[PDB]
Amino acid sequence: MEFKVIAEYFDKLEKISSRLQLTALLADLLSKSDKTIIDKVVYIIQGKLWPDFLGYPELGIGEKFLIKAISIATNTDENSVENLYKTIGDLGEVARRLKSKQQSTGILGFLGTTSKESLTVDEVYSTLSKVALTTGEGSRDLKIRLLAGLLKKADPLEAKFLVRFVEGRLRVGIGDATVLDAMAIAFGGGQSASEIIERAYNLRADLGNIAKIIVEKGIEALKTLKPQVGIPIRPMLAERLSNPEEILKKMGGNAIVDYKYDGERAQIHKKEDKIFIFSRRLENITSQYPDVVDYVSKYIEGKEFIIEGEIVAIDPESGEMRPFQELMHRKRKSDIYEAIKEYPVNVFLFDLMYYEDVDYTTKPLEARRKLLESIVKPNDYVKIAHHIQANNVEDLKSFFYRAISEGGEGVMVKAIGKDAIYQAGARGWLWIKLKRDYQSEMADTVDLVVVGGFYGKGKRGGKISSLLMAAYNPKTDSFESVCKVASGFSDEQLDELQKKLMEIKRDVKHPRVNSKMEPDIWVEPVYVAEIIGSEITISPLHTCCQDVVEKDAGLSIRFPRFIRWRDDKSPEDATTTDEILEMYNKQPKK
Amino acid sequence: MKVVYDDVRVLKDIIQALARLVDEAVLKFKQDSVELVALDRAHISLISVNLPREMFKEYDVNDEFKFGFNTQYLMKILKVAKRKEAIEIASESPDSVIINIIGSTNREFNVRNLEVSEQEIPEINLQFDISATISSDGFKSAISEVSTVTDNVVVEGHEDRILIKAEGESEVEVEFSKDTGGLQDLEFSKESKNSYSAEYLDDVLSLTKLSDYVKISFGNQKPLQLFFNMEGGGKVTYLLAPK
Amino acid sequence: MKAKVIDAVSFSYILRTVGDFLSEANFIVTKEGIRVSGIDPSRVVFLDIFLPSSYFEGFEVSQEKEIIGFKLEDVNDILKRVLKDDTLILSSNESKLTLTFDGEFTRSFELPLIQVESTQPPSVNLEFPFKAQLLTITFADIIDELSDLGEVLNIHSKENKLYFEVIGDLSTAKVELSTDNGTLLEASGADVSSSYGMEYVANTTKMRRASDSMELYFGSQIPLKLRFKLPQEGYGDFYIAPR
Amino acid sequence: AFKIVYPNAKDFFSFINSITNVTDSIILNFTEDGIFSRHLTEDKVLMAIMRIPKDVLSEYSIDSPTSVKLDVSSVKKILSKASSKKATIELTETDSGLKIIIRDEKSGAKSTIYIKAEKGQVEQLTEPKVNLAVNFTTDESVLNVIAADVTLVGEEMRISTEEDKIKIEAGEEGKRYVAFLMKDKPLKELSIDTSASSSYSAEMFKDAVKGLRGFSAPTMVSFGENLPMKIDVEAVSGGHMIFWIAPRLLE
DNA sequence: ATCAGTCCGACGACGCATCTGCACTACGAGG
DNA sequence: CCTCGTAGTGCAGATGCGTCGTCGGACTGAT
Ligand SMILES: [Mn+2]
Ligand SMILES: [Mn+2]
């Protein structure tokens, strides 16, 4: 009964990253410990308090609130930790130095009684559960209070991971899939039963209930498993390939292709008279989509089925799909019935894995791809994606011309054969989720002057791997920022950037450069670099062409990428605001 | 355990210093009075309320009473009465306490005792250097005024003045020196220089106004304390860690 | 056509109470009444409000039955601009609904006649076991303070009395409306049960300062029949589907 | 180094609010003939001028004409609270910055105000010398009513004046606003000379109006045929405000 | 020594919650 | 009716989440 383990034993799981001992150490977590606590420690290794299908609030402490909370914990001001973290960059390894002055009495410990102790797993989990649900008018000072108090009752090594736990993903080197082999090599010997553990984990998305079921029972408990309605099954995925022909020689006679759309792939459910609309990330989105529950229970003549499909937004005039950005409007919880009249929708169904109360996870793609054809009848609403059996090799590209008009670009390749079933759990070479040639951005070559830099975040964020670029304006003899560059530099270039900036480091901003963004340090404009981008976009952050096109906004270069330095070009020879505006004008309006 | 309270404003304002300070408290109806002292999770601030058997229409007790509550829920279930409506609090079983609001509609609610545990608080037994007395409405206005843009306020008074000053952008100060309207009372031991931050130290807003006589207890290297006195022997004492 | 009411804050308030349940509605004019009805897109709440022939100050009819269908947001938010005590006259000849105020400042608003409707007049003849009569000024004072302790209510009657009880989470609210208590006018005896949500009964409290009395026809496994008694012989029915 | 007391603190707050709605940094030009300030917008569409004739001040002693530039980034809010209509406010220069004081005879809660600024060269008092035909007086709930009414149904408001009549027509063809000001409506006095129409900036109309709440005295409003409108009203304890908005002659 | 599978993780734009603080107004009550 | 105190709403500003994937670079391990 102690949470000190997730500091002491968990300090070594980031310096020995080898996939030979981190799995061995992950075994020690479930080697010999408590009964119900293990089911609760499981959620550490997924960056969650609990699986997101049961229905629970999301922790509201993000970064700036966490900044204020840690300022309260260390009795410091807002700006000190702000700058100390901006310079370091990797937020979370700040608390070790923050709790370097271990002196905080305040009240409750200075008058009659002095005491100090630690916590345990069941305490932290309970506090997190309570802090998630608390909401209302008394919110800002109450959510911060618990994090601050636990931090004040934390330890220097604890305050290395307690910050990141609130931040999100554990920066360890271990994911959820490794927990699947952890118990496999801990309780039931080794990797021999790892396939069985994965098989049991596939159809039910939980991680506490499954773990408890396995713990209370034996290893053979991984056998009697069926998809029970409700708790969904983890969807499978694949990769993107550029090879035009690498599938026919491995599969049947060109088989069938059923396109590939976007739109927040979702698993429809149906039990008795209830239906659930679980999505990609295993979150309840049934309420936010009340227009699809009437599409399934009233037009899919089934009894109890769990299927897979995608819910793409539909244009209000005709059916030509829409970007998922426009689909994002359907995340409202209050004015739900109003947005329905503006943005129509149409779902498509690809997979069909459960009916007649009998499992269908491991079956050929003939009773799965085309199973309930007399059930999902054609209507003015949800259909099945158009598929046509490809005859010969040359037919792998003929339907591209017709299917590109929809806007989904790439298609998938259904692979027949007993070796090719819908066994989920691992994203790999199962059935080709190609993208043809997809759609890339544009290319434009310009030369820009380095005027500032930003320290990056993460394990490699110590160096100044991010820069702010500015353009010379002959009319005003001033430099205005046009874009912020953080990627495109090789290892040697990144290493030399710090020394180059230090050789010209200045405390105060140069009078001839102006920008609304505040860099970590100010750099004299000396060197000129070439940056390639996609398109010019309006951004209020940058002062380039201010108020020329849009008021209180400026032009910015989308997708910055470094190419090469320009040692023979002076800053005055850099791209000008007039040239930027002229290039922007030539771009298509649509 | 039947109790009747004539007023609701006392039960609509005292918890404002309790609603957002510590989310859990132990409403402790004693065998002879009602006294409330509860710690806080921040380990910074702490409020206390003293109330004897002078404002209760009926008060019958036999054993200790520990009706738990949620601060937000307690405020919610005490927002119905507006003008003068009385209250009727009693039950028979220690699982739910029937909270009946007297007047208008015969209305009683059932609320679970969300029991919580907390440590005890000693009876201060600490002396301070200054126990001043100003206009409570004026002093509350000063706490709301000097800290409107800043995020830290410094308290400094040398001999005959009190300045809760907040600096960093503009050194704007409010003084109550001699009998010019402020400083209705003053005890002295040394010159004063301290700070008290903004935000939830500004969130003691709608508590002072019950009695228009504030009384600070600020002192060097000592926690804060606001001293009060209401009718019927009701005094509320504040606590606050330095800066 | 020419329309006018004696209370610019009343008719606009009855229509503003339709701005939380109905996301759309249509207007038609009968020989001696104006119909505010239509089935909500929520497919649960049924709304049909009848304006009496006596609410106006010179209502006229030109040719025959005319549809004056509107858009919710405009005729709701432009008519949010009401003074403390004004008069609201409505003029709409063929295409433009001109919401015109008069009194302290003769002002007007303009809006084209938008044509969109959902005219489903379902039959309402199912009988109910229970009957009660409560004034418009107590039902709201109860439900609004009951509108925050969850989202689902329950109604049960025994020995000829109406018990408003709110359940959910861990704490319950009880209300004991009764003729003897005086919080009633007339009622009847029938022991039945049902259950209803809050958003379907809390969004309709806004029509408080527009009515004189209130008729509630509670029932068992049948739609809830809340009738808002109108000044000068009007109909204020608010049908609610069961749980 | 001067010492001038304004017996009404809320009047000073109203003046600084009225001048704030045009910019972020303001001035207080101290001359031997009074206390006055001047500003204008970047697009030359609206501006506020505040002046204090040297007859209403409790005391008024200045050696040389002095002007100082100050910002109300913090001064606005630190002066946003003054809970005494009977509070006197006084301003006195310091060695380096600006120092203002407010006195209330209710709680002795004297508040000290410090502003980091220094004196600068003054500018000669110059007001646009124009004559406006239509002239009338009104309350503080007629201009605000027009502003709030128009703030929704459009941004182009036209104030039309007929023979002893006033007509409002604004917005676009889809949504308009109809109202009249018959002799002795929400006005009080009228000095109309010629029936003329004009237009201004409805959003900036409300922006100009919203810095006027607290004027217990009637407001005198005048304009002309495409003439920049005058919105004139003085507070209880002295101080005359003159508001300029420029007519946007088509867009 | 050389490429296959395999795997954790970092990435930075968009639209909507959700709360916090302020600004203005409506009403109830003692004089 | 005058005045004040408090409830009540309307509205900007600040933090956070969900969302498509996209590409990376290192590890095992059999020829
Ligand atoms: Mn996070
Ligand atoms: Mn999430």
Coordinates of C-alpha atoms in Angstrom, one line a residue, chain D residues 13-233:
Chain D
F13 CA -14.4 58.9 -13.2
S14 CA -17.0 59.7 -15.8
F15 CA -14.6 62.0 -17.7
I16 CA -11.8 59.5 -17.8
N17 CA -14.3 56.8 -19.0
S18 CA -15.6 59.2 -21.7
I19 CA -12.1 59.9 -22.9
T20 CA -11.0 56.2 -22.7
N21 CA -13.5 55.1 -25.3
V22 CA -11.3 56.7 -28.1
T23 CA -7.8 55.5 -27.2
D24 CA -5.7 53.9 -24.5
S25 CA -3.4 56.8 -23.4
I26 CA -4.7 60.2 -22.6
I27 CA -3.5 63.7 -21.7
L28 CA -4.5 66.4 -19.1
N29 CA -3.4 69.8 -20.5
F30 CA -3.1 72.1 -17.5
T31 CA -3.3 75.8 -18.6
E32 CA -3.8 79.0 -16.6
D33 CA -7.3 79.2 -18.3
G34 CA -8.5 75.8 -17.0
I35 CA -7.9 72.1 -17.3
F36 CA -8.6 70.6 -20.7
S37 CA -7.6 67.6 -22.9
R38 CA -7.9 66.6 -26.6
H39 CA -7.6 63.4 -28.6
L40 CA -8.7 61.9 -31.9
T41 CA -9.1 58.5 -33.5
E42 CA -6.8 56.9 -36.1
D43 CA -9.5 56.9 -38.7
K44 CA -10.8 60.4 -37.8
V45 CA -14.3 59.2 -37.2
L46 CA -14.9 59.9 -33.5
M47 CA -13.2 61.8 -30.7
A48 CA -13.8 63.2 -27.2
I49 CA -12.7 66.6 -25.8
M50 CA -12.8 67.3 -22.0
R51 CA -12.2 70.8 -20.6
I52 CA -12.7 72.4 -17.2
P53 CA -13.4 76.2 -17.2
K54 CA -11.6 77.9 -14.4
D55 CA -14.7 79.0 -12.5
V56 CA -16.0 75.8 -10.8
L57 CA -12.8 74.5 -9.3
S58 CA -12.6 74.8 -5.5
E59 CA -9.0 75.9 -5.8
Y60 CA -7.0 76.6 -9.0
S61 CA -3.3 77.6 -8.8
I62 CA -0.8 76.9 -11.6
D63 CA 2.3 78.8 -12.6
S64 CA 2.9 77.7 -16.2
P65 CA 0.9 75.9 -18.9
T66 CA 1.7 72.2 -18.5
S67 CA 0.7 69.1 -20.4
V68 CA 1.2 65.5 -19.5
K69 CA 0.7 62.3 -21.4
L70 CA -0.8 59.3 -19.4
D71 CA -2.2 55.9 -20.0
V72 CA -5.3 54.5 -18.4
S73 CA -4.3 50.8 -18.8
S74 CA -4.3 50.6 -15.0
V75 CA -5.7 54.1 -14.1
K76 CA -9.1 53.1 -15.4
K77 CA -9.5 50.1 -13.2
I78 CA -7.8 51.5 -10.1
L79 CA -10.2 54.4 -10.5
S80 CA -13.1 52.2 -11.6
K81 CA -14.3 52.0 -8.0
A82 CA -15.2 55.2 -6.1
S83 CA -18.2 54.5 -3.9
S84 CA -19.0 58.1 -2.9
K85 CA -21.0 60.5 -5.0
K86 CA -19.8 63.1 -2.5
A87 CA -16.1 62.3 -2.9
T88 CA -13.7 65.1 -3.8
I89 CA -10.7 64.3 -6.0
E90 CA -7.5 66.4 -6.2
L91 CA -4.5 66.1 -8.4
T92 CA -0.9 67.3 -7.6
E93 CA 2.3 66.8 -9.5
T94 CA 5.2 65.0 -7.9
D95 CA 9.0 65.1 -8.5
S96 CA 8.8 62.3 -11.2
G97 CA 5.3 61.0 -11.8
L98 CA 1.7 62.0 -11.4
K99 CA -0.1 61.9 -8.1
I100 CA -3.9 62.1 -7.6
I101 CA -5.9 61.9 -4.4
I102 CA -9.6 61.2 -3.6
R103 CA -11.3 62.1 -0.3
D104 CA -14.6 60.8 1.0
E105 CA -16.3 62.1 4.2
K106 CA -17.9 58.7 5.0
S107 CA -15.1 56.4 6.1
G108 CA -11.9 58.4 5.9
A109 CA -10.9 56.1 3.0
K110 CA -8.5 58.4 1.3
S111 CA -6.9 56.7 -1.7
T112 CA -3.6 57.7 -3.2
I113 CA -3.1 57.5 -7.0
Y114 CA 0.4 57.5 -8.6
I115 CA 1.0 57.7 -12.4
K116 CA 4.4 57.4 -13.9
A117 CA 4.5 60.4 -16.3
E118 CA 6.2 63.8 -16.8
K119 CA 5.1 67.1 -18.2
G120 CA 5.4 68.0 -21.8
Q121 CA 5.0 70.9 -24.2
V122 CA 1.4 72.1 -24.3
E123 CA -0.8 72.5 -27.4
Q124 CA -3.0 75.5 -28.1
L125 CA -6.7 75.0 -27.4
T126 CA -8.2 74.5 -30.8
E127 CA -11.8 73.3 -31.4
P128 CA -13.5 72.8 -34.8
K129 CA -15.3 76.1 -35.4
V130 CA -18.6 75.0 -37.0
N131 CA -22.3 75.9 -36.6
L132 CA -25.0 73.2 -36.4
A133 CA -28.5 73.9 -37.6
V134 CA -30.5 71.3 -35.7
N135 CA -30.0 71.6 -32.0
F136 CA -31.9 70.0 -29.1
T137 CA -31.6 68.8 -25.5
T138 CA -32.4 65.3 -24.2
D139 CA -31.9 62.9 -21.3
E140 CA -29.3 60.1 -20.9
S141 CA -31.8 57.4 -21.9
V142 CA -32.6 58.6 -25.4
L143 CA -29.1 58.5 -26.9
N144 CA -28.5 55.2 -25.2
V145 CA -31.8 53.9 -26.4
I146 CA -30.9 54.9 -30.0
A147 CA -27.5 53.3 -29.7
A148 CA -28.7 50.0 -28.2
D149 CA -31.6 49.8 -30.7
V150 CA -29.3 50.3 -33.7
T151 CA -26.5 48.1 -32.3
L152 CA -28.3 45.1 -33.7
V153 CA -30.2 45.8 -37.0
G154 CA -27.2 47.5 -38.7
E155 CA -24.1 49.6 -38.5
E156 CA -25.2 52.5 -40.8
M157 CA -27.6 54.8 -38.8
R158 CA -29.1 57.9 -40.4
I159 CA -30.7 60.6 -38.2
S160 CA -33.3 62.5 -40.3
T161 CA -34.8 65.7 -39.1
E162 CA -38.0 67.1 -40.6
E163 CA -39.8 70.4 -39.8
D164 CA -40.0 70.2 -36.0
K165 CA -39.8 66.5 -36.4
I166 CA -37.1 63.8 -36.1
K167 CA -37.0 60.6 -38.0
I168 CA -34.7 57.6 -37.6
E169 CA -34.0 55.1 -40.4
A170 CA -31.1 52.7 -40.2
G171 CA -29.8 49.2 -41.2
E172 CA -30.5 47.6 -44.5
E173 CA -33.7 46.7 -46.4
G174 CA -34.0 43.4 -44.6
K175 CA -34.2 44.9 -41.1
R176 CA -34.8 48.6 -40.2
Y177 CA -35.9 50.7 -37.2
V178 CA -38.7 53.2 -37.2
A179 CA -39.1 55.9 -34.5
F180 CA -40.0 59.6 -34.2
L181 CA -39.3 62.4 -31.8
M182 CA -42.4 64.6 -31.8
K183 CA -42.1 68.1 -30.1
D184 CA -41.4 67.4 -26.4
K185 CA -40.8 63.6 -26.7
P186 CA -37.6 62.4 -25.0
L187 CA -35.9 65.8 -25.5
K188 CA -36.9 69.0 -23.6
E189 CA -35.6 71.9 -25.8
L190 CA -35.2 72.2 -29.6
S191 CA -33.2 74.7 -31.7
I192 CA -33.7 73.2 -35.2
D193 CA -32.7 75.6 -37.9
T194 CA -32.8 73.6 -41.2
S195 CA -34.4 70.1 -41.9
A196 CA -31.3 68.0 -42.6
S197 CA -30.1 64.4 -42.7
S198 CA -26.7 62.8 -42.1
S199 CA -25.1 59.5 -40.9
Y200 CA -22.5 58.3 -38.5
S201 CA -21.0 55.0 -37.2
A202 CA -23.6 53.1 -35.2
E203 CA -21.1 50.9 -33.4
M204 CA -19.0 54.0 -32.7
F205 CA -22.3 55.8 -31.9
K206 CA -22.9 53.4 -29.0
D207 CA -19.1 53.5 -28.2
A208 CA -19.4 57.3 -27.8
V209 CA -22.7 57.0 -25.8
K210 CA -21.6 54.4 -23.4
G211 CA -19.0 56.7 -21.8
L212 CA -21.8 59.0 -20.7
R213 CA -23.8 57.2 -18.0
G214 CA -23.8 59.3 -14.8
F215 CA -24.6 62.6 -16.3
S216 CA -27.5 63.7 -14.1
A217 CA -28.0 66.8 -16.3
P218 CA -29.8 66.9 -19.6
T219 CA -27.7 66.3 -22.7
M220 CA -27.7 68.9 -25.6
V221 CA -27.3 67.1 -28.9
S222 CA -26.8 68.9 -32.3
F223 CA -25.6 68.0 -35.8
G224 CA -26.2 69.2 -39.4
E225 CA -26.3 68.2 -43.0
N226 CA -23.3 65.8 -43.0
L227 CA -21.9 67.8 -40.1
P228 CA -20.0 66.1 -37.3
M229 CA -22.5 65.6 -34.4
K230 CA -22.2 67.4 -31.1
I231 CA -23.2 65.6 -27.9
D232 CA -23.0 68.2 -25.1
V233 CA -23.7 67.6 -21.4

